[PDB]
Symmetry: D2
Subunit: 180 residues, 4 copies
């Protein structure tokens, strides 16, 4: 036994009490008093209960951004993993990894410089923490990525191997290996 | 000819269609995030009652503090300076049979119990003890008959008294709880058992059940990433005393 | 003050000293004495310095499995993330997530089931195949999307030939899998002993830990996935959006949102 | 119209061709893993010198114990019962600016320092303080002047005494280290700085630089996953005494 310096410091949630507390509030009480998912987002990302106006905007941003079909990088990454027989959380994690400068992670930088731009601007105008901006697209698109994983599993989709005609093999001319 | 086949969403029009419905029209008519979840995972617009339950399941499942594998994985990546989506993806990778799996397994086994052991709770408990081990969704380290779980009491009371939904899995689990708690006080119906039963009773597709925990915990993981970044947290390196180095004896490398 | 206990127990490496010790051996001393990457693999995954024969086999398994073009799930996943502008480690992690029962990660299970077959079905390949069909589903290590009897996998042919002609290794698992292949290919030409099955059997015959088997494919294919990420970045490849004609939109008829 | 363009490998034949060379032919003629790395990342068969350096960088960097972010991430997933490739992918996600992935930036800034500040290390350090912040490739959590990193000492000695490599970046970084360590003992030239400088001095492709640590540390992360699985390690929950709960007081939810 000895003195321990904490490894981490947390300010948003705790589970040592009767039930988990999100920015000091019990989820059962948040449910009982008519709060929603958008309110829990505000608590865990902003440490305060959103106003009615903010709640309604958060709800709409998430609904509008939930999915944009299977062709886009996040959804396609989740589909590729679903077809490779990967379990849901790990498959969605591969799709989530695609979120960044070119696909849906432009919201934080576009709010900095002024649907990544309307949302980015709106979130800056709501004075939400700068570090939180990408969260709206990450969370919203997780709804769609889970959906695509379920869809492929319902269909028992087989492994994807990209068709040869879809690849430009701009490879080196074949050479013999020289003696070492 | 096609590389993939999709059935849930169409982005070819002016805006995406989720199971045939336009996203802006869902917003305009007062629908919520829980409605979009039902559309993309079940291809059906939830009823008001189903929507209220989906809402509560997501809110209750959003986070469980920083110590658990999901949140902690996101914190470890946040402290390593990794960007939010990739950091949250590392936390999400922890979700599986040991972390989050109790929900899906409780739904699976309580559904099996209703179907195969409708008038035989002892037979169900014996089959589980032989084939699975502890019953998923039963038991808690601190919650008990003497120390009840407020989230379970709330969720059960809400679906029983504030909706007209039919819950055969949850009803069966509540009968199981009467039997298990008589043996040992800590063998209560836990939050994972309550949610797993409710999801089966909502008739969501079997492949969808893990989605509720994955999506809800993404709210908490994003929150932990933001929290670490707001604090300017530093890189984590486990202290030497937190490691039991049960290593091989030191040896000289022999000549080839 | 608290009653502290270890959060983790480790047995493979010790970083406390001037440099890490891998299964008791100093990393720089392994370099100095002419050992290689394959020796470090043996130490960290098996806690034993490979013999020269084991070292030569490990080296070949990794070299032969390093890459198999951009069309396969792991390479394609790394390419998708590279084109999305994602940094190398995170992009390669998305490709690595694709390694599993259908692509590259059937090594562990192939080794497990062929070892079981040698023990429980030594002179009964049909019995083994029937048990697998009933209890597991497709046989891990059997089958390929492009390789077949007509289009053989020279990676498999090379590894088998190296083991058989250039080592004195006794290979009961590999021998049994080769007998299984004769039976499976007679039904369908694509039901060959694949790279995962070949590696899995060889590793079981080398008495490598059963938990280690998938490691060889995971590590080897990381070389290729990093290569694809570099390749796409050298080309300044743009974001990929799957062409509309490659998608069968079997979607619901469009509907108006009803009032609440 | 192709979806992707590839230049490094061809799998269409009887076996793959890596930058035009057949895999089994590389095996047959006595080449190694380090030669396959050179082919797939540089599209050129390494010289004897390059091959020996690649081999050593990978061996030296393979593992650094369970306490570091990438190993700890793989262990957390192993303990959560996640399969090896997905668990190692969570550990690999930790590689970035603070852990293992400073190689590219260290190479970039030391190369620039050789051109812009050849006889002015204080000028370089002042520019970095103002424009970047901490110098990539400088500093370590445990290694210091009092606790040297023998991995760094060995690689530097090997390059200097056992190769023909002209090393302006490495030489410059070693001069920087003399200045930084005089201020604070922990501001050593770290493994990321050492590898980054060596790779720039070898004129390897700039996009390849982080590959060496990513690949090498995958050996260690796989090793940790196997180790935890051999031990049948249970799910990790970070001990409460390791967390500083600076959380809001428990409070009643206000009415809407």
């Amino acid at each position: 036994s000895h003195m321990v310096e904490p490894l981490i410091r947390t300010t948003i949630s705790d589970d040592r009490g009767e039930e988990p507390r999100y920015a000091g509030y019990a989820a059962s009480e948040l449910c009982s008093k008519g709060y929603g998912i958008e309110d829990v987002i505000g608590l865990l990302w902003n440490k305060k209960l959103p106003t009615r106006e903010e709640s309604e905007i958060i709800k709409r941003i998430v609904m509008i951004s939930a999915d944009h079909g299977p062709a886009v990088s996040g959804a396609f990454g989740s589909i590729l993993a679903a077809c490779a027989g990967i379990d849901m959380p790990q498959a969605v994690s591969a799709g989530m990894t695609m979120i960044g400068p070119r696909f849906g992670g432009a919201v934080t930088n576009a709010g900095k410089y002024f649907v990544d731009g309307t949302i980015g601007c709106i979130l800056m105008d709501l004075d939400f923490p700068v570090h939180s901006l990408n969260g709206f697209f990450v969370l919203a698109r997780t709804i769609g990525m889970i959906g695509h994983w379920i869809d492929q599993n319902n269909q028992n989709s087989r492994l994807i191997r990209l068709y040869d005609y879809l690849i430009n093999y701009a490879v080196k001319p074949e050479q013999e290996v020289p003696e070492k």
